[PDB]
Design a protein around this ligand. Structure first.
Ligand SMILES: CN1CCC(c2c[nH]c3ccc(O)cc23)CC1
Lengths: 333, 257, 50, 217, 229
């Protein structure tokens, strides 16, 4: 049954090439560049005493949650820098953290195979472990909320799972990835999500039934970052090959590649502005860069972090961008 | 010609001292990795060096270039007191830094709990207290050795017993390091010897001639006295390099700036 | 074993031209640029971060 | 400026900051140890003697609180999560001597040691190597010579010489000899002395870190 | 759950100890307020102690006369009372509050205990009585002498409903957010200085006294109280 795999892959590539009548590079040539997008560090969130690997912005564009190796989640009031909540973690090894769209729940996890959900609206005040999503056989890489009751998870098992917090058990398991899944991205409509894995491939999945809609390839190394375009018809990915690639779901292939000779290191996080014109991705060597989603030019540099920019997030309204880093500090730009 | 050459040499020395001290303090403050009790003691020593360089050295060159100093009848006493206080404070900062290093290397486990900003602050305040203790008794114009007992006690408590503590602590540190290729041990021994030799060649001759003049053993010439005074002053310039250049964290902090 | 069936199912999806998708993306970008504070520095009066 | 509730929120933030600082100060004195080895290297036995995913084992010895990370259950890609342990004071490595002729787990253990010790994240991290289950090595070697797996081995197939050669080959894999040190030891099923050796290694690592801070190392 | 103890008849100028045992919640992380209600008059703020006793405030009528302390290990709130005046007679309510973005201060009120003795913003509720019937819509108007719209945009106003023979319960906080467990019938809106409470499809349990409270700056003040029957 594997003899026809190469033939089908060749047919898919031929169809993609036939439908590739033009490229975004020649289509956006006449569009004026966004210019130098200068951003200042409006806020400097301090209080973390260990390497920070994940963060998530709130739907209100004010509250954000960050995770560090100190085994605790800190809810930051970005407008005033106040720490809304401090949530000790039973496991000090946390690699991902998510903030519920309604804000009533916060989830995180990591080397522990549980994407523990924390209830911020607890009656007793102190934040408790509402549920533990056990069942994964590998380190958790990312679990993003869908609603108060549904949440997706990605881990090192090479598979993603959909969980119901009330039930506490998997309801839809996503399989097909050969490499470890490192990131997740939820579409604006919440109907589809794309997960990047270490096999240099990004796959589109359906939450309702778990079927893989599409498979994306082109990266030369492991994929560590993924984020949807605001319209939901495209998404960008960041891999260890130091080049960010933009994929359109309908086109089912790469559209633009963002890379520079100066950058010779992998990508850690990727995000899009509200309009999606500006592509912001975290990079090694302790600085971040902004790429024009259309012109692919380096719009600007978000420098100031003393360590790797592990995570990057943009407010739903696009008012500000908060970048986490291993120096235990989050800076809002 | 000679006066101008001395002027430029002393001016460049003091300017380099104060710029290096300012760089050290800003690097320590800006970098979070440099927020440790040992780094706090190093920063205290650096600020003491900056204070002695920006309060004493200007008047030092002013007096050296033109001998007849008349800036103020009472100002001379204040200048002498502050110079003595700052020099003793720097010497005791070196002593307490050596003591902290010895405790960390030997009592690496027990001393870990006591290694806190509170302990560094207590050390700094007690160093300042000892300096003012030695400097209050006195409270062309220069300190006169009219009391043999006072000068003997001050020189004993300012450089000689802190020198003995420095030597003992560094010998113990070297013994622990060698007990614990040989290129690394050679480098450690070279660093310790360089620090000890710098401190000795900078301060010891000045206190030797201070004892000589105080005891009336010999009449030290003014030129030699000033030369040894500046040889002791350059200890402030030397200390930041010795106590920061050899630390990888300080290397990164300086490279960042 | 399931990989062949998964690839067969994936290959049967609808296909689109790059030109129209890129045009739609550019239209969305230009339409939402006015509503992008990052692209256009918002005045400090309306900026919650200062 | 701040209202009554805003002042209360700032006070709550200050209390959270104080709690965070206290927790960080407590964790700074805590010793972080990473446990690695083959599947049957005996790391589980080691942690049991001292005391699905990562397992944290906490124990105390001579005023030092030690927390060990058993990452043997992590079958995922190593470089995607190994970097999290960059701050570990030392890395404990478990190797089963008896598995020299068991099918070639010694080869896999040596590859693991090469990958971990030479990793960019562990350039300055010391490795506390452990040779587990020599009570089986001393007997099996009598019947099965060590030359079966490694023809390069020379000399009599004695337990002492074989152990010395295996140790030497282990530290031969270290490409950062001038930057890190390997503290090899044999378990011998001696809980007290094994924990004493671990404590001595931790103390030595802390002393070298202090010397590095002083520029002597 | 909050229970108050240490009441009873006292002589004028005497001293008594009030204990407010706290259970069912993290008392350490919750700020505590003391509110005293006379047998017929409205609520009156007494004192406030923040979490960890880092900040303590008292009303002008009791400043320098009443002291408030906390003991986290025992989960009990203490209020040492000395030099009790004749007017001090009132039912003291132990109020729970937590202050952070999106929080609901004064959400939970204790049952309260009755004690008998032998510049600030003032809320106006001239509409003391407004008869209502089930299924009818009624509006309660509250006015303040100072604008409660802070520079940050938060209108620090609170609505409390007290049923006959029951302690007050938080109804609306910040004039726009409904506290947990409050039916969606109640709504809150108003201008910087004009405030009003809207009740839709009023039903039997809505009967009670509605109090308008301001939290812009201490001391806290409560309205006269609108009685619905
Ligand atoms: C430039 N300064 C260098 C140090 C010197 C001094 C410090 N302490 C003393 C005690 C006794 C004494 O005779 C002299 C000194 C005063 C001059």
């Amino acid at each position: 049954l594997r003899q026809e795999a190469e033939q089908l892959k060749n047919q898919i590539r031929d169809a993609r090439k036939a439908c590739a009548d033009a490229t975004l590079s020649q289509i956006t040539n006449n569009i004026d560049p966004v210019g130098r997008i200068q951003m200042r560090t409006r806020r400097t969130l301090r209080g973390h005493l260990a390497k920070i690997y994940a963060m998530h912005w709130g739907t209100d564009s004010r509250l954000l949650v960050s995770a560090s190796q100190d085994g605790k989640l800190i809810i930051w009031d970005s407008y005033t820098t106040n720490k809304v909540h401090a949530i000790p973690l039973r496991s000090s090894w946390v690699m991902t953290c998510a903030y519920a769209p309604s804000g009533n729940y916060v989830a995180c996890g990591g080397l522990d195979n549980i994407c523990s959900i924390y209830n911020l609206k607890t009656r007793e005040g102190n934040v408790r472990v509402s549920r533990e999503l056990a069942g994964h056989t590998g380190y958790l890489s990312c679990c993003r909320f869908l609603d108060d009751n549904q949440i997706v998870t990605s881990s090192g098992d090479t598979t993603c799972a959909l969980w119901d917090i009330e039930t506490g058990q998997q309801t839809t398991t996503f399989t097909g990835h050969t490499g470890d899944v490192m990131s997740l991205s939820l579409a604006p409509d919440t109907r589809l999500f794309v997960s990047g894995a270490c096999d240099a491939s990004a796959k589109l999945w359906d939450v309702r039934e778990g079927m893989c809609r599409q498979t994306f390839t082109g990266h030369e190394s492991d994929i560590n970052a993924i984020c949807f375009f605001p319209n939901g018809n495209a998404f960008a990915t960041g891999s260890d090959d130091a080049t960010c690639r933009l994929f359109d779901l309908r086109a089912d292939q790469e559209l633009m590649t963002y890379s520079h000779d100066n950058i010779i290191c992998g990508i850690t996080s990727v995000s899009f502005s509200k309009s999606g014109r500006l592509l912001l991705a975290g990079y090694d060597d302790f600085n971040c860069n902004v790429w024009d989603a259309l012109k692919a030019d380096r719009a600007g540099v978000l420098a100031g972090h003393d360590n790797r920019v592990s995570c990057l997030g943009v407010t739903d309204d696009g008012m500000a961008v908060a970048t986490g880093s291993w120096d235990s500090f989050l800076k809002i730009w | 010609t000679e006066k101008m050459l001395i002027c430029m040499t002393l001016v460049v020395i003091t300017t380099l001292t104060t710029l290096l001290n300012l760089a050290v303090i800003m690097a320590i403050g800006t970098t979070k990795k440099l927020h440790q009790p040992a780094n706090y003691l190093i920063c205290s020593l650096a600020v003491t060096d900056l204070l002695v360089a920006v309060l004493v050295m200007p008047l030092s060159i002013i007096y050296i270039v033109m001998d007849r100093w008349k800036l103020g009848y009472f100002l001379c006493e204040v200048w002498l007191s502050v110079d003595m206080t700052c020099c003793t404070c720097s010497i005791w900062h070196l002593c307490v830094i050596a003591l902290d290093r010895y405790w960390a290397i030997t009592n690496a486990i027990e001393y870990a709990r006591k290694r806190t900003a509170k302990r560094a602050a207590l050390m700094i305040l007690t160093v300042w207290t000892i300096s003012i203790f030695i400097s209050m008794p006195p409270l062309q114009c220069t300190i006169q050795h009219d009391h043999v007992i006072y000068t003997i006690y001050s020189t004993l408590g300012a450089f000689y017993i802190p020198l003995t503590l420095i030597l003992i602590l560094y010998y113990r540190i070297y013994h622990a390091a060698k007990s614990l290729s040989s290129t690394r041990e050679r480098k450690a021994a070279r660093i310790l010897g360089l620090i000890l030799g710098a401190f000795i060649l900078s301060w010891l001759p000045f206190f030797i001639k201070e004892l000589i003049v105080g005891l009336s053993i010999y009449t030290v010439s003014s030129e030699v006295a000033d030369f040894l005074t500046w040889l002791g002053y350059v200890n402030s310039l030397i200390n930041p390099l010795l106590y920061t250049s050899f630390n990888e964290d300080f290397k990164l902090a300086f490279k960042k700036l | 074993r399931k990989l062949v069936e998964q690839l067969k199912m994936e290959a049967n999806i609808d296909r689109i031209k790059v030109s129209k998708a890129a045009a739609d993306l550019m239209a969305y970008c230009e339409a939402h640029a006015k509503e992008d504070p990052l692209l256009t520095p918002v005045p400090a009066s309306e900026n919650p971060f200062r | 400026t701040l209202s009554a509730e805003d002042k209360a929120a700032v006070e709550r933030s200050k209390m959270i900051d104080r709690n965070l600082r206290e927790d960080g100060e407590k964790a700074a004195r805590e010793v972080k140890l990473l446990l690695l080895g083959a599947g049957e290297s005996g790391k589980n036995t080691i942690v049991k003697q001292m005391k699905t995913g990562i397992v944290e084992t906490h124990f105390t010895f001579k005023d030092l609180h030690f927390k060990m990370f058993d990452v043997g259950a992590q079958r995922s890609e190593r470089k995607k999560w190994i970097h999290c342990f960059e701050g570990v004071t030392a890395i404990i490595f478990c190797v089963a001597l008896s598995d020299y002729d068991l099918v070639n787990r010694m080869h896999a253990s040596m590859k693991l040691f090469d990958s971990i010790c030479n990793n960019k994240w562990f350039t300055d991290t010391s490795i506390i190597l452990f040779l587990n289950k020599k009570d089986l090595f001393e007997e099996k070697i009598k019947k099965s010579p060590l030359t079966i797996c490694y023809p390069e081995y020379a000399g009599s197939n004695t337990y002492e010489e074989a152990a010395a050669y295996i140790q030497c080959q282990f530290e031969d894999l270290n490409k950062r000899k001038d930057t890190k040190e390997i503290y090899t030891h044999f378990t011998c099923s001696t809980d007290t002395k094994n924990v004493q050796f671990v404590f001595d290694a931790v103390t030595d690592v802390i002393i070298k870190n202090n010397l590095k801070d002083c520029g002597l190392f | 759950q909050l229970v108050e103890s240490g009441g009873g008849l006292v002589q004028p100028g005497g001293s008594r100890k009030l204990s407010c045992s706290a259970s069912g919640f993290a008392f350490s992380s919750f700020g505590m307020h003391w509110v005293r209600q006379a047998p017929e008059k409205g609520l009156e703020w007494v004192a406030y102690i923040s979490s960890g006793s880092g900040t303590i405030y008292y009303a002008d009528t009791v400043k320098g006369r009443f002291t408030i302390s906390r003991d986290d290990p025992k989960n009990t709130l203490f209020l040492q009372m000395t030099s009790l005046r004749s007017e001090d007679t009132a039912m003291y309510y132990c109020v729970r509050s937590i202050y952070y973005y999106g929080s609901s201060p004064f959400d939970f009120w204790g049952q309260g205990t009755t004690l008998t003795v032998s510049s600030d913003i003032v809320m106006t509720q001239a509409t003391s009585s407004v008869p209502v019937t089930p299924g009818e819509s009624v509006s309660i108007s509250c006015r303040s002498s100072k604008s409660l719209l802070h520079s940050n945009g938060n209108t620090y106003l609170y609505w409390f409903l007290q049923r006959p023979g029951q302690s007050p319960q938080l109804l609306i906080y910040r004039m726009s957010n409904l506290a947990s467990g409050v039916p969606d019938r109640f709504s809150g809106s108003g201008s910087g200085t004009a405030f009003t409470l809207t009740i839709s499809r009023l039903e039997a349990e809505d009967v009670g006294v509605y109090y308008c409270m301001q939290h812009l700056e201490y001391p806290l003040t409560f309205g006269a109280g609108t009685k619905l029957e």
